[model samples]
Target: MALQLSREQGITLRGSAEIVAEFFSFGINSILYQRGIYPSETFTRVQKYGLTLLVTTDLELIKYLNNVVEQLKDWLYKCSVQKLVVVISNIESGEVLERWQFDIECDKTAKDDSAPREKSQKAIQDEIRSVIAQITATVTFLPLLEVSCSFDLLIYTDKDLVVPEKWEESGPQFITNSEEVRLRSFTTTIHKVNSMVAYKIPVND
Candidate 1:
């Protein structure tokens, strides 16, 4: 049966953490490029999830994302993270322009069991491919970014987690009267990530 095949390709909590964190690493990059938060010249093409993806070549951005993803892996492994958000805002006016949200549903039972979950890596990657494709396609429907913008990353974790050094507390930077679009999600049987993007609705004269 297919169940047996999934069991053979077991996925552990640590493994799931790596998969989800890696997705965020690339997913955020794709969003930045697609949304024009940074110049296209700052990104370099790379293959991932069977697709030609673009990642940042900026040294400071590379360092920032690496640090965030490293800490995220720890929170994900402990099942302490609830959500991760990428907020884009206008630099001049300080208004939120778009919010890319990934809500995580962790199977806390995995922490106590210590046993790998049943889910083939290929199946997970297929799902991730679809998610990334949608992310790329979003530019067609998303409003154009006319003003200079910058982005911020936010992690929502369970209460009682000590804020790591260099990471400060931040409120949820939500956009008002925004149009929302839900995107495809992927799971490793231990962690399920549901993605959505909300952007300010264009005002028509």
Candidate 2:
């Protein structure tokens, strides 16, 4: 049977996993737009969670993010995922620029079992909205990307799952001389995500 999740307390493992994955999709899109990572014309406006949002229409990006969220859901279900980081860097110098992190906190009590925990959908979405608001506000103080830049999504999981044929292993990408700002976080009684950003300030200030 499908688990009780929407508008109810204690979400099922599958439900919570998908919810977190979906949040990443929108969250990434929000940062890309706010940071001007992609051209303005590449994104389209859509309404979600009581706010208008912009999402990319690039076919390649759509496919790439789909793969990411799908894999993330699996790890999330197992409660093995610890963090999700989107690293932005200078394309020419390969210098790390910004690291957008979402720390994942899974409640041990949360399981596939049908037990119920209490939290309303409104409460959950409202929390998500607050995070989005903070994302939108970040453009105010964060240094602008003055040069061509690129980004990669890095997933942190407890399991050393076999790498897919198309995926390659890599070392942790770290930024130097970085400044960090912690943002708002929300929970679904099962998964809690804390948001933050670490970026390198321009030297010439």
Candidate 3:
């Protein structure tokens, strides 16, 4: 028999995995827009999680993120990914300025084919909304990034897994003496995400 399940009771690994991947897509866009990582004209606003959010219309960025999120779905299904980080760095000096880290705590005991734990989709999205709210509010305290910046999506996974093509090995990009701020998190029971933002304040500030 096929896996006996219904969306009401809970969502399977595939379903939950997609949820996490989609969050990254929206979350990254929110950050890019709020931080002015790209020209404001490059984005278009859309409705998501019951809120209006700005997302990029840049073709190159869309293609790059698609590849990253697709690979993330695969890793999430296997419960191999432990942390997903979006690192923003200075374009000229290549210094990490801010790190948006979402630590993934997977309930490894739950098998992919097994019945999923109980949690409604609405509840999960509510939690996501809170996270985005916190992200948006950070401009009040987070130091300004006046220089041109670029970012990297870092995936922390099991050491044994093979690195996929087009993704090279990289060291943990950490900020020195950075201030850390915790934020709200959302879960699908199977995958728990704890989020935080760490940033380096320039000495002048």
Candidate 4:
């Protein structure tokens, strides 16, 4: 119930149609061609409506998004690290995955209807601003300390929603073996109660 989806707006976005043009549909046709099942049309389309929400709470996702908002509130915060990139991605096997790399690609996951990922479709752009607001409000009461940081978040998902062929390297990867970086490359096994999501949160240092 507390995921970062912050929003509140009335303006419409341009080229917004592209966002609805289900790009993934094209991917499906490609697969059909691979198996000699080419369809009559290859026009891909997406119907995602921009989310519109009146965010009034400090959600955790906003905190993660604005992890560096306070640190970079002003230009005075010169970056000494040049570029510190953080990546959180869905690898394959959660049990085998321990840690990820500098890029978290959330798109590399399966569509688990079990997982709740529904959010308004219009307020996409305003979410970041809301996160900034949350960050500003948060640091206002905290001890004085200026920190600079940058971050990048990525999502992963299999091309197809149903039983994919390369399921091994398709699902979000999780970490296991603590001593060693035991990670799964793809999704070969499906979880009984898995949420079809490849969530990622990259926080750079």
State the C-alpha lDDT per candidate: 0.68, 0.67, 0.67, 0.24
Instruction: Give the clash count for model 3.
Output: 0
Q: Give per-model TM-scores.
A: 0.74, 0.74, 0.74, 0.20
**1-205, model 2: which lDDT tens digit per residue?**
2334442334455456556666678778877777667675788888776666677776777788887766665545455567777888878788877668877655544446433345344544665676666776877766555756788777765545575432223544346677777887765556677788777866635
List of clashing residue pairs for candidate 1: none
TM-score of model number 2: 0.74
| Cα lDDT of model 1 by residue, 119-165, tens digit | 34565566567666677788876666687788778777655546644
Candidate 4 lDDT over residue span 1-205, tens digit each = 1134321221121112122111111212222222112121432333222322222122343353344333321211222111112222223322221122211112112345332235333233233223223333333532332222122332233243465565234665443222222112211211111112121223323
| Each candidate structure's count of clashing pairs | 0, 2, 0, 46
lDDT of candidate model 2 versus the reference: 0.67
lDDT by residue for model 3 (37-127), tens: 7676898878776676668786777888887777676545454567778888878788877778776654533655443445355655676
Candidate 4 matches the true fold with a TM-score of 0.20
Error of 2 at 69 (Å): 1.2
TM-score of 1: 0.74
Question: Could you tell me the lDDT of residue 60 within candidate 4?
Answer: 44
Regions of candidate 4 where Cα sits further than 4 Å from its true position: 1-14, 17-128, 141-153, 162-205
- Candidate 1 Cα outliers beyond 4 Å, as residue runs: 1-12, 106-119, 159-174
Worst 10 residues of 1 by lDDT: 1-10
Worst 10 residues of 3 by lDDT: 1-10
